[PDB]
Amino acid sequence: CVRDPSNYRDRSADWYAFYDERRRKEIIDIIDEHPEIVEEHAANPFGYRKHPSPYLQRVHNYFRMQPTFGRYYIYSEREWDAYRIATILPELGDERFKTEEEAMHAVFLRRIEDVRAEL
Amino acid sequence: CVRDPSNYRDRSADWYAFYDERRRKEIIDIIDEHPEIVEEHAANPFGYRKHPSPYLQRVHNYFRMQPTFGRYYIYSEREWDAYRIATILPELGDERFKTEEEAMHAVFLRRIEDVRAEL
Amino acid sequence: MKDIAIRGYCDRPSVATGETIRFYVSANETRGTFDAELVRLIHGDSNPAGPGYKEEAIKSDLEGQYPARFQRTQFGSYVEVADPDAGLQPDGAFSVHLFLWSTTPSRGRQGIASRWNDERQSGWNLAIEDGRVVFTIGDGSGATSSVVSDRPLFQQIWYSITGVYDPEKKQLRLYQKSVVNRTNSRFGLVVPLDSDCAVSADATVKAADSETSLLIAGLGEAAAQDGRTWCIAHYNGKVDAPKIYGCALGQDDAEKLSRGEIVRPISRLAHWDFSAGIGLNGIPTDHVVDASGYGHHGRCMNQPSRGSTGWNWDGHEENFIHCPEQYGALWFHEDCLDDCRWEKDFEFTVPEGLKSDFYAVKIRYEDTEDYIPFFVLPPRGTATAPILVIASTLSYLAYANEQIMHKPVLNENDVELHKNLSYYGLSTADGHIDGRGVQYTSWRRPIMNLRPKHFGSIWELPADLHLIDWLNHNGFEYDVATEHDLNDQGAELLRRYKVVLTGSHPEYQTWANADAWEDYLADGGRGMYLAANGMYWIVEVHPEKPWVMEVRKELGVTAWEAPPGEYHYSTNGRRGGRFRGRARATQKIWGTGMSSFGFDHSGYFVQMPDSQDERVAWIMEGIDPEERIGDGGLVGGGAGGYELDRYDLALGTPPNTLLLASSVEHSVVYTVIPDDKAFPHPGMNGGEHPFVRADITYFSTANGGGMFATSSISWLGSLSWNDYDNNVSKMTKNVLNQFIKDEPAPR
Amino acid sequence: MKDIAIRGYCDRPSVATGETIRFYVSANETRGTFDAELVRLIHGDSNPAGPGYKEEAIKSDLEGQYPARFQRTQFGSYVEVADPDAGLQPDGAFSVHLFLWSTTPSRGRQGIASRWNDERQSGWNLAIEDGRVVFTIGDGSGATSSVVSDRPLFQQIWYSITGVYDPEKKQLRLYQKSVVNRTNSRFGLVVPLDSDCAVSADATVKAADSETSLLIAGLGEAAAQDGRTWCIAHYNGKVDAPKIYGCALGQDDAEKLSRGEIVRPISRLAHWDFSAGIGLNGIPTDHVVDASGYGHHGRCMNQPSRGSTGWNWDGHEENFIHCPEQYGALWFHEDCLDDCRWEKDFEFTVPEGLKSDFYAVKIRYEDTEDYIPFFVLPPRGTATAPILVIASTLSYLAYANEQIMHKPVLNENDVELHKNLSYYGLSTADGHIDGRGVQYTSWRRPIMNLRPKHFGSIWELPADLHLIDWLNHNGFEYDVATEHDLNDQGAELLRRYKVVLTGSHPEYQTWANADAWEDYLADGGRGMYLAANGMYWIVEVHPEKPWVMEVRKELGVTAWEAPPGEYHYSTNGRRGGRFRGRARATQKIWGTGMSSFGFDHSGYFVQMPDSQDERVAWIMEGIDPEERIGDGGLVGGGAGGYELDRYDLALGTPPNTLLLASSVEHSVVYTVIPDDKAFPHPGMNGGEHPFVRADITYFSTANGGGMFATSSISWLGSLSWNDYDNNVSKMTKNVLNQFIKDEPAPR
Amino acid sequence: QIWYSITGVYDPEKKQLRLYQKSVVNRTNSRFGLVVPLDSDCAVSADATVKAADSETSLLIAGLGEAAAQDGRTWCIAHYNGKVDAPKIYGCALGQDDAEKLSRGEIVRPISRLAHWDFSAGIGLNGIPTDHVVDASGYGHHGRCMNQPSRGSTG
């Protein structure tokens, strides 16, 4: 019989761990075998009038759907004319960015460092 | 007064003509810059255990949704051991193929001939 | 090409012992004879990498020679009103009023309401020809008399059309008025729509007796021979409550009919109310009530769409059993078929000594060889084996005569579906020429994609012959039921068996079948789900016609979507979309449910950390724990492929369920189903999302029971790989040697 | 970082002349005062590439200093029963029964039903702590007496719970029983569920008077001051028909209650039927009826979900107005807010000479500037301009307090939504802690993403201030109405004006607004649809509380999906999902409707061959035929962006529609919306599928009027680019100078 | 025994009282029917010389208050005799067109209500066995039937 709700867990989390392991290996192999997408994202993070490469688009598809995607915001105030990187009260960073394209490329580099540090 | 149905046509067909124009130009440029996709598709047309290139998948996404996709069926009967390629009664072809991978690659070549032979 | 020259079907899918089946066969032309005998299907797939075709001919009373003949098929929907007395052919003045909603207004000549003869042009009709509404009378001498409208018809716009005949001034008259409101038509009230006319012409002849029935949505071909009238020119679109008066009308009375007011009730001759009979359980009938009290009752032929939106529909009620006065329309497609109405050629009564298995009838013409599959049950109330194999016949009717060339590898059976559409009918995954999906499908027609002979897409019944051949090659003794039988009986059918296997693609189930499965598993039952996409669409069998199925779809893994007011079924009033939207998802019963679909090739399974559990070492016994479960096979090239089911606790997987393996190496072509998307972002694909996977599960139920699910279509295509020496057959053999024992199922 | 120290809200969105708006302000702590002054808003976007922030001060009777004070906000759905005479505290034995469905049974301590004081432990309560059901009484001197269940609760399972107090044996009892069927719970009847107990403890104290109100889904904080009982321990999940008896029940009585039978109907003290008052107009009221005749009528606070699936819901009916005996539950989230109930600080009567425009009350605290937006109408029945601008306030309530960090650039008003959730509430685009999305939203709370200041998307009020700034930079004279005023007044509001402009994102409409737009354009009316996603979701304004909006979404462009039996609105018993599924698509009224969406940047418009037509030579008057339209702007750097509409005759685009331009260069991140997908397959993205486009259209209605549709959001954002000299501004100005003439709009 | 619609409007911005009156007879609800030539409609006005001050009493339907509320009890004196269907107070002055739309049962200006007692809120499948009169404006000004008026009467 079934009587206590703490004896039973979500057994799909084992597969989420497995999927995340193989997924991180694939993404760091994409980053290492193609070192031009980092400069491609530095030149234009929004893809304004130049849509991203398929490998850069695959890296963007990997980052934008994590449960750990919900870190690294770009904080501002109405009286700064600058951009700082919030990190999850949140705890801001230190280096300032005069445009938000520099802030987005900083967040992208910091996410590449985060996916390298977890392997 | 809107009184006669023949006075009015579906005016989105002009945009479909414009769209098919630009899309055919982009696909023939993608083929003429990366000619190895035909070698890859002759290697393994189903993508079995080797998933296709992003450009080859883009070519397949262009081919699998045109109104002209409804041509080119592969036809066979129970006592042939041969694969013939129909063309819309259907117009059966001449060349015989002993697997359907050869027939699919011939269909893919003939669709490249069709997209070149229009503009 | 090879020209298929013989066809056929059965009256009913399953036949027990002692009761009689009938076989209805037609040929291309009446000459010669055809041979016939009984076979027993063992394997169907003639893939050279596999076991190939297998059968076993049975001596019975069935065989012999029978004369071949051509049998004409009525094709298309209509309402037939029988009138032997010519009461609906008036002597003097008469009027005809109906509401009209045309979907193909320019597709040939279309008759709306006629008591007409077209051999000799006699009677009267109210037809659409050259895009205009034309009210013609005739007398049989060839000389007709027409009145033709000025304004043509728009597509899918409700009109009110009155045809008036007046001998006192020797004049025909025709009225026409658009009755659009905010909701019922193609476009709305913002248009400057001028489509109203009131024209007339002189009448030179008299409307004589046509010697036919009265038809709605059609003309009559010739005189009524043996009490049967052949409909020819089929209308396409809704018709809401037609009526005949016995006097000539005026423009003011046509104006008042165009507001739905019944003018002159005592002067009616007939008035068919298409919404008379709608109770709290739909309208499960074919009987069309004469609402004028004269007894001119109708009869729906070839299944038009009951329970459709009428002319006065505003979207305050979207359920027709609670607002029946806004739902009096029938759709009348030109290409429906619920029964071929053929004449019998030969019958067959199942003897006492005949094993329950898949059978067929091998018809042999001159140069053509055809099969008619039917099933044989055990005797009523008994069981001859512990293993029951349900043959998923509702999903056989789902993809019955599924046409791709009309809409990829093709045989000579698909070019016959293209070349003779009027003999074969359509599938529920098809679409009508109106642009609407097919709701009603039928068994009493030749289903050409059901025959066992002939990578990317293997048909339904050979995919069950996979499991049948696997059970025959091993030592397992089995019975066979159908989903129609499980609908008819319930869990009383299932409780006579120790374990119940499920077919290759059990996609369309009735509500009562799901209740029977939950009642069977709930008390000591055992079951295997060796498939995927397994309880997706709600389906109801028609109560009067048990060979006709119904499904009305919505946004899911669908070929089409139902129009806005028309989601509730006509055979019962209940909602019936997909099972997941009714809080009855597949995970609540079987453990897994639909997650992703694709169409190129298959993948293999990788063992999860619950494979090494000591509770379920009895499943993964003769399998090294570093292997790949199911790589290579006859469908796709792997076990987990082409449609996938996943474990999910939020949809209702039992909390004690184990997750034994999972499928990997799926292409980017495997998309995530529309049921799991909130905002579609890119990367909703296989290899880029955590929902594209299969999941092999197990959970125990009460009173010593269990359930084992493998969550893939191509699991059964891997059983006969490497000459029955692989991991798929060893796993299925472990669980099937466990479930038929007499100890309770393990926890 | 920056510490937001001052808040506030209006009691109503729009105010005509001669009537009073009240402003309800609060600060973090009670010290000092605050300034206030009225301004007129002109341009909101403080982007340095645009015009910059623009306001205008008004000498009114409002400015001065007012005392700052902190005001506590009640937060969470519950049901409060006023009991002054302490009738629901029996002097002897009593018993409590209720049905239970819990979403978060392990999130702290959660009170279910109670007449309890928490500062001093007095009264009785039925609660959830440690995942178990605990029934506790207390005397007031700190000493309690509890009885605790044995089996803990499962998540989202219907339980029947009977708390029993019995002084004659000095014994507390508690009977717990699970009442799952096939459809109402998280999992089905296939589980061997053992979640039943019957326990007992020792009542050592006597239950005293808590001097509070009886609460469902909550414990009372302290004693009742000014008749208000503060609620602390909120519950998360459905409660179905609670009842209090005046006698100690037995196990047989608990067994008969668990089947739905009312035992001892004269021994009841109170019985709250939550399904009492469900007619064919829904249940648009907060009055919880005492169904036993004692006058213990409750009152829903902070709007729990009326009309939710009960314990006895088999899915034979899904519309709750036709089966009210199976819809007696209320959801009770812990984080709802429909009114802050704050005490007034100051009010403002609108004087005579005050132009109808957008206004705001600028509150100046110590180092924090705050705004409170509201709208001023023309006087009732008067039209002081030939142009009307519809502020899309229903979509302002949709995206009100749209929390992202709780769910990418952030300002200081987003981290304060995250840090203080109890002061602000949630948005319909968000979801609750239970997993169900937020349905009800409200004006009477501080909406923090509505303040006008601060490359991606912009909040909805500065996106309309773009249009306000463009009208003020030219010489056009306009009025301002809101969608609440359109809802209240109908097409009588619209018939006073020549041309009516629509706001930047009018996504959520009511049905009455759609009827007003159709009746206005049908009879000589003119409009501009300067936006996209135009009429997608159906909103109904609550009839008792006109500040409360309701939406129950479904599949489509959503963020959350409604649970299976709960699609129908409670403010009116109607279906109300998206407009397109009610046969009222956006193309049928405004010519174009939703086709695609995405989030990176914008494109530009390429002209179609109907630009060179001479019927539309008045539109393209100063534009060379080789130019781009909107290539560069404030929103994405283009005019066609972020959400796109298209031309479609099948959905109801009027036939005489011309197609002026169309948008290109959309990335692969722009997906096709799920309404257009039959089978999802790869290539359903922007630049790879034809449906991803914007379409500038124009059709002419009857009696000299028409409609112009730009079909993109960023069209208004690209009006001030290159200092008002671009193709977008000249095209908008050409069409607007044509519409405000006295000649009929051309054909 | 003739159904009227009566609107009383106070306007300080013009220092003016106003009163509207309109008969709403249909075929069935009144003493006589639609065959009469009934002219009983008016729209008059006067001068507001004073200000409406606090009465320190309860609000009554069908009655006046006698003196100030002593021990929380207000003594009703001048009793009306006849039906009263759903009274409501707005917080703003109305016009003749808005009184015309109230006289068709359309609730005008829903956000500007102060109170709106719906005498038919509570009617289930077992009658209305209560004395509690629901404020249908959502402000909490709930009523209390005193000395048993006839519930469930024709509107």
Author numbering:
A (entry chain D), B (entry chain B): 8 to 95, 101 to 131
C (entry chain A), D (entry chain C): 1 to 407, 419 to 465, 469 to 761
E (entry chain G): 156 to 310
From the paper:
We show that DMFase from Paracoccus sp. strain DMF is a halophilic and thermostable enzyme comprising a multimeric complex of the α2β2 or (α2β2)2 type. The active site consists of a mononuclear iron coordinated by two Tyr side‐chain phenolates and one carboxylate from Glu. The Fe3+ ion in the active site catalyzes the hydrolytic cleavage of the amide bond in DMF.
The mutants Y440A and E521A were catalytically inactive. Structures of these mutant enzymes determined by cryoEM show a loss of Fe atoms.
